[PDB]
Each structure stands twice: as structure tokens, then as C-alpha cells.
Design an enzyme around this catalytic site. Sequence first.
Site, PDB file in Angstrom:
ATOM      1  N   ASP A   1      -5.352  35.359   9.180  1.00  0.00           N
ATOM      2  CA  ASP A   1      -5.993  35.400  10.474  1.00  0.00           C
ATOM      3  C   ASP A   1      -6.894  34.162  10.572  1.00  0.00           C
ATOM      4  O   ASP A   1      -7.965  34.096   9.972  1.00  0.00           O
ATOM      5  CB  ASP A   1      -6.803  36.692  10.636  1.00  0.00           C
ATOM      6  CG  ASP A   1      -7.653  36.713  11.929  1.00  0.00           C
ATOM      7  OD1 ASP A   1      -7.545  35.763  12.750  1.00  0.00           O
ATOM      8  OD2 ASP A   1      -8.434  37.689  12.128  1.00  0.00           O
TER       9      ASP A   1
ATOM     10  N   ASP B   1      -8.408  42.796  22.361  1.00  0.00           N
ATOM     11  CA  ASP B   1      -8.882  41.870  21.326  1.00  0.00           C
ATOM     12  C   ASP B   1      -9.809  40.812  21.905  1.00  0.00           C
ATOM     13  O   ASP B   1      -9.356  39.836  22.527  1.00  0.00           O
ATOM     14  CB  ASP B   1      -7.707  41.173  20.636  1.00  0.00           C
ATOM     15  CG  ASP B   1      -8.131  40.407  19.358  1.00  0.00           C
ATOM     16  OD1 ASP B   1      -9.338  40.107  19.158  1.00  0.00           O
ATOM     17  OD2 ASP B   1      -7.237  40.080  18.540  1.00  0.00           O
TER      18      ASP B   1
ATOM     19  N   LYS C   1     -10.485  26.023  17.118  1.00  0.00           N
ATOM     20  CA  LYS C   1      -9.441  26.805  17.750  1.00  0.00           C
ATOM     21  C   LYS C   1      -9.546  26.731  19.290  1.00  0.00           C
ATOM     22  O   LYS C   1      -8.597  26.989  19.996  1.00  0.00           O
ATOM     23  CB  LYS C   1      -9.538  28.264  17.284  1.00  0.00           C
ATOM     24  CG  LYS C   1      -8.405  29.164  17.757  1.00  0.00           C
ATOM     25  CD  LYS C   1      -8.374  30.410  16.930  1.00  0.00           C
ATOM     26  CE  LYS C   1      -7.405  31.419  17.464  1.00  0.00           C
ATOM     27  NZ  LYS C   1      -7.531  32.711  16.737  1.00  0.00           N
TER      28      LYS C   1
ATOM     29  N   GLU D   1      -1.832  37.959  17.740  1.00  0.00           N
ATOM     30  CA  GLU D   1      -2.938  38.739  17.169  1.00  0.00           C
ATOM     31  C   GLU D   1      -2.937  40.250  17.465  1.00  0.00           C
ATOM     32  O   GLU D   1      -3.073  41.058  16.544  1.00  0.00           O
ATOM     33  CB  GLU D   1      -4.286  38.037  17.418  1.00  0.00           C
ATOM     34  CG  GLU D   1      -4.452  36.830  16.468  1.00  0.00           C
ATOM     35  CD  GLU D   1      -5.445  35.716  16.906  1.00  0.00           C
ATOM     36  OE1 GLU D   1      -6.075  35.798  17.989  1.00  0.00           O
ATOM     37  OE2 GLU D   1      -5.570  34.714  16.150  1.00  0.00           O
TER      38      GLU D   1
HETATM   39  N1  LIG Z   1     -22.168  43.444  15.921  1.00  0.00           N
HETATM   40  C1  LIG Z   1     -21.730  42.559  16.835  1.00  0.00           C
HETATM   41  N2  LIG Z   1     -21.953  42.767  18.152  1.00  0.00           N
HETATM   42  C2  LIG Z   1     -21.521  41.892  19.079  1.00  0.00           C
HETATM   43  N3  LIG Z   1     -20.827  40.770  18.799  1.00  0.00           N
HETATM   44  C3  LIG Z   1     -20.528  40.443  17.513  1.00  0.00           C
HETATM   45  C4  LIG Z   1     -20.969  41.341  16.435  1.00  0.00           C
HETATM   46  N4  LIG Z   1     -20.533  40.782  15.282  1.00  0.00           N
HETATM   47  C5  LIG Z   1     -19.879  39.636  15.592  1.00  0.00           C
HETATM   48  N5  LIG Z   1     -19.870  39.444  16.919  1.00  0.00           N
HETATM   49  C6  LIG Z   1     -19.264  38.296  17.619  1.00  0.00           C
HETATM   50  O1  LIG Z   1     -17.845  38.343  17.534  1.00  0.00           O
HETATM   51  C7  LIG Z   1     -17.326  37.017  17.369  1.00  0.00           C
HETATM   52  C8  LIG Z   1     -16.544  36.980  16.062  1.00  0.00           C
HETATM   53  O2  LIG Z   1     -15.461  37.903  16.202  1.00  0.00           O
HETATM   54  P1  LIG Z   1     -14.097  37.741  15.366  1.00  0.00           P
HETATM   55  O3  LIG Z   1     -14.430  37.309  13.963  1.00  0.00           O
HETATM   56  O4  LIG Z   1     -13.182  38.903  15.556  1.00  0.00           O
HETATM   57  O5  LIG Z   1     -13.521  36.510  16.234  1.00  0.00           O
HETATM   58  P2  LIG Z   1     -12.328  35.568  15.677  1.00  0.00           P
HETATM   59  O6  LIG Z   1     -11.140  36.383  15.184  1.00  0.00           O
HETATM   60  O7  LIG Z   1     -12.869  34.568  14.701  1.00  0.00           O
HETATM   61  O8  LIG Z   1     -12.123  34.834  17.110  1.00  0.00           O
HETATM   62  P3  LIG Z   1     -10.772  34.692  17.980  1.00  0.00           P
HETATM   63  O9  LIG Z   1      -9.967  35.904  17.582  1.00  0.00           O
HETATM   64  O10 LIG Z   1     -11.330  34.684  19.397  1.00  0.00           O
HETATM   65  O11 LIG Z   1     -10.138  33.378  17.545  1.00  0.00           O
HETATM   66  C9  LIG Z   1     -18.513  36.093  17.380  1.00  0.00           C
HETATM   67  O12 LIG Z   1     -18.722  35.729  18.747  1.00  0.00           O
HETATM   68  C10 LIG Z   1     -19.634  37.004  16.923  1.00  0.00           C
HETATM   69  O13 LIG Z   1     -20.928  36.542  17.304  1.00  0.00           O
HETATM   70 MG   LIG Z   2      -9.557  37.140  15.978  1.00  0.00          MG
END
Ligand SMILES: Nc1ncnc2c1ncn2[C@@H]1O[C@H](COP(=O)(O)OP(=O)(O)OP(=O)(O)O)[C@@H](O)[C@H]1O
Ligand SMILES: [Mg+2]
Length: 601
Positions: A7, A193, A69, A170
Site C-alpha cells: 500500500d 476510502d 502521490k 485500493e
Molecule cells: N484519528 C484520526 N482522525 C482523523 N484523521 C486522521 C486520524 N489519523 C490519521 N488521520 C489522517 O488520515 C490521513 C492518513 O490516512 P491513510 O494513512 O489511510 O492515508 P494514505 O493511505 O496514506 O492516503 P491515500 O490513500 O489518500 O493515498 C492523514 O491525513 C492523517 O492526518
Molecule cells: Mg490509502
Amino acid sequence: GKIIGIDLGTTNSCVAIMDGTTPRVLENAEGDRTTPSIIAYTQDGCTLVGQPAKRQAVTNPQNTLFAIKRLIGRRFQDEEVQRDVSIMPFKIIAADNGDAWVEVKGQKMAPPQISAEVLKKMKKTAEDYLGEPVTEAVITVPAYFNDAQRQATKDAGRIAGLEVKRIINEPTAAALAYGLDKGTGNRTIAVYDLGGGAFDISIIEIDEVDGEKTFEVLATNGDTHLGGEDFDSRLINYLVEEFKKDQGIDLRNDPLAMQRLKEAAEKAKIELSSAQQTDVNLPYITADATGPKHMNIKVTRAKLESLVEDLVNRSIEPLKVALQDAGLSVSDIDDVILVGGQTRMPMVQKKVAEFFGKEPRKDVNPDEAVAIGAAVQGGVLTGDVKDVLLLDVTPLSLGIETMGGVMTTLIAKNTTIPTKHSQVFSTAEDNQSAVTIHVLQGERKRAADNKSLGQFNLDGINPAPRGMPQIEVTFDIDADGILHVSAKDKNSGKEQKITIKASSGLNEDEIQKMVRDAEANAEADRKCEELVQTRNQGDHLLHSTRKQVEEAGDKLPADDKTAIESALTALETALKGEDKAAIEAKMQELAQVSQKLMEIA
Ligand SMILES: Nc1ncnc2c1ncn2[C@@H]1O[C@H](COP(=O)(O)OP(=O)(O)OP(=O)(O)O)[C@@H](O)[C@H]1O
Ligand SMILES: [Mg+2]
């Protein structure tokens, strides 16, 4: 060996392997099940990925890259990229072909090379765990990624020394992770998502007939530039506007502060997912025409909700479309599944729940489901996961531009992939030697309002009156969701060569070269690591030798105490620099002058 599942996230990345029939998420070297998608290029030639990159971003703002990304597979002149140019602390530039690249220490770099550094950390993580080389991966992308974005991600895999066995959408991966144990209930599910950068909604049917699971994507929609970063941005803007009122200062002209504020805003945001209120408390934010200043601003959950409600609402519209496309009503949904960190916000959960009139599940890990799903996908490819069938779709209409600048659809959005579409083309004029086919992705009725994939020129056509030649052009979309255009003279069957102009993405030469650059970086990383070990050995020697000088005390000749202390000093200075040979040298000199002291010790 094993096919690892990666991922590759806007904010965080995650790697999982298939351990027989059960998937495992792997901890990285720092001990964490996820890795921040952050890449830093140091002054000394090292590349830092993840937490180490994160920590030094403040001292190295121009050379610490993140949210790549959100640039990958995009053009410099895109509205989204143009906005990011004036926001990012690193420099976003136009590549020679017009693609959005970054400049790091005077070097133009393509987003796939940067994302390759993250993929490399994940590969090595898996290799550290498995105790063997890993050469194959399944890599994830947002369902709503277009052709250029998908191919640029696949190129990132290749630059990282990975054979990309599958590019998986995803929500589909999350569905595979969910369907692994769970129903099982010829269920129809909605996967919502919302990540750090992208938003996807997929409606997916999981019917199990005679122990044969079929995962079919009925519809998919989203926004590849809507995510947690935008939530952060709303709060950041609120803070500067508030600070501008209460202190009279525009705080945006300070890059050190911005970055510490970005981290402050994100921390406050995350805090407000369980608290009713928090404080953005940053002391020594910057010093003015007086002295060191401090921001202290209270933020309620309600204030945050008010600042991002419209972003949350923008995610509701694609749910409506995807339900329309799937031919379903809200009540046809058996399960709602939330994925992505940004769905941990109470308001997001609430808005989704009231749209579907149904509580989302609570037994799906919103951080790991995608990685796990990628690993499962890999298992299906090898055979280690039997009786699973995957029918995904392409999220965007593929068409050509016709007379008047109008879109003619060849392959409609939500068509099952892989898929083929053929059409015969010909000349419009006497002795025409080339025919141009302008291919695009999008739902808009005018070409200019859709995403161009490039001009496909069928050149070198034999002399003939109007409409003579019969060139059959075939448009393939593979299992990765990626387009391949091939041509062939209908009459004979002999192929027809195709030249692509005005396109986006890396050519074969650039990729081969970038693969070699990544190998060289990996080698330099080894050197930076070795220098760290040398500095470690140097510090052990300093200490050992000081203890011995201390213990000998009065008994040590003054001549020798002078010399040893000078050599200890010299070593201490070398240890503060970044030159391995100089450290080895001063260490060696120290051992020589202190040799009799150490011997009796
Ligand atoms: N407890 C929480 N409440 C609200 N938002 C959160 C929390 N924890 C993380 N986030 C937010 O979620 C995001 C990270 O999510 P995630 O790791 O699923 O995204 P990703 O898979 O890296 O991104 P994408 O899938 O969009 O490429 C960041 O914006 C982070 O600040
Ligand atoms: Mg993601």
C-alpha cells in the site's frame, strides 16, 4: 520468492506478505507497522525515508519530499499542481515534456523516482523479515487514478527494482481483506476510502457459490485530489488568519514555522477525533521586531467540523453517482466499510452512516486493510489463494476526440477489465500519409474538458485515394487498468506502427537510467550507514580511552597524558564531521599513542 503487497499511500505506506493462507503486516526497522511516505535528501548524500525523514524536515525543508502521490502522473500546468507549487516547501517544476516534477539540490526528479524510495524501504522491510530477496510486488493505487497515474506508479515499482505483478485498486484490495474471513454472505458492500490525499468509493459484490468467491466491482467513483492534507489545509488557513488578527503578523512568509504549523494542525486535527477541544500551542514559533513569539489558539471539535464540512460533503456526491452506476439503491447495501485514517473523524463516520442509513463496520483496520488486500491479490496470482475471482472495472470513460472537439466513447466507465475494443480507421484525404487519433479519459462531452492520454499517429501509410486503407485500431485495458493501443491493417493482418505524441510519462530510456540511479542511491545509502557505524565505533573508543586515562590517574606520565588528550580531542572533531576516512585516521592515531595505556588496562 514471495510476492509482497505494498500500500503506497499519500501519507503512510504499509507492506504485507502472504504467510500461507494468512496475511501479515510487517514492522519496519523503526518498529512501526506503517511508514510515513516521506523522502529526504541530505547534505551528505544519504536518502532518509519515513520517521528519520520526518524528524529533519525542519532543518531541510527544500529537500524533504512528501505528498508525492498527489503529483505522480500529473502535468505541471494542472490546476491542482499549480496550487501545490505555492504551498509546498520543496520546488515543483515542469519536466521537459510538461510533466510535474520536483527539483532537489538542483536536480530535476520525476515523482516515480521519489516514490521508488518509499517502495524500496518497503521492499527492504520485507527482505529484512523474510531473510531473502524480494523481487515481485502488488502495488496499490486509488480506484480513480487515471492512465498516467497508474503507469507512473507501475514505473515507480520498476525503478525500485520490483516486478509489478499487479496494480490493484485500493477499495478492491480492502474488499479482498474483508472477504478473506468475513461474509461470505453473497454480500454487496460499499467501500468508502478517504486517505491523506485521495478519495474513493466502490460498490462491490462478493458472492460465494460452491466455495468460489467472486469479487465484482459494480461501480467506482471518487476524487484523487481530496484527502486529509486538504483537511489540514483548512485548519492551517484558520490559524494564520487568527494569528494575523491577534498578533498582526502573516506567518506564511516563514518556512520553518509553516512546517511546524503543518505538523501542529495535523496533530490538533487528530486530537479532535477523540477530544472536544484542544490547543495549538507552539512556543517560539518565530521572532519578530521584538523577540521570540508564541502562538496559542484554542480549537473545538465544532470549529474543525465547521472548517472541513464542505470537504466532507464533496465526498458524498460520488456516492450518489456510484449508486446510480451500480443500478442500486442505498438499501441494497449490506455493509459499509470505512478505510483510510481520515475516516476516524466522528463527523465523517456520521455523514457516511446517515447517507447509507446504516452503521459502518467496526472490525476493519482502516490503516492496514489495503496492504493486506494487496498481499491477498499476490496470493491469488501465485496460487497460494485458491478459488478467488476478481472482476474489477475501469473508472473512467475512454474515448477519442472527433470533429468539433467532441468526445466519442469507445469504452464506458465501469466496464469490466481486462477489456478490448476495436474500430477501423482510414484516411480522409488523397495520398494521406498519417492519421492522428486523440485518445482521452473522462465523462465530459468536450475533449478539452477531459484528460488527454496523447496523440496516436498511424504514420507511413501507402498512397491511395480517400478511405482506401483499412487500419484496425485495438484499445486494450489490462488487469492493471492501463491502456495499450495497437494497430493492424485489416486487409492483410500485418501490424501498423504507432507513434505517441503529446503524451505524459517516462520513456524507456529515462526508466532504465532511473533504475541505475536508484541502484547508485542504494549504494550511497550503504556508505552513509557505514559512516554511522564508524562514528559509533569512534564514540566507543573515545569513552573507553577516557575511562582508562581516568583510572590510571597520577600514574600516567604527563607526556602521554598530553598526547592522548590531544588525540582524543582530534577524534572528537572528526566524529562531528562527515568523513569516514578522517575518523578512521584519528581513531588509529589515538590507538597508537594510547597503546601502552590500553594494554595494561
Ligand atoms: N484519528 C484520526 N482522525 C482523523 N484523521 C486522521 C486520524 N489519523 C490519521 N488521520 C489522517 O488520515 C490521513 C492518513 O490516512 P491513510 O494513512 O489511510 O492515508 P494514505 O493511505 O496514506 O492516503 P491515500 O490513500 O489518500 O493515498 C492523514 O491525513 C492523517 O492526518
Ligand atoms: Mg490509502
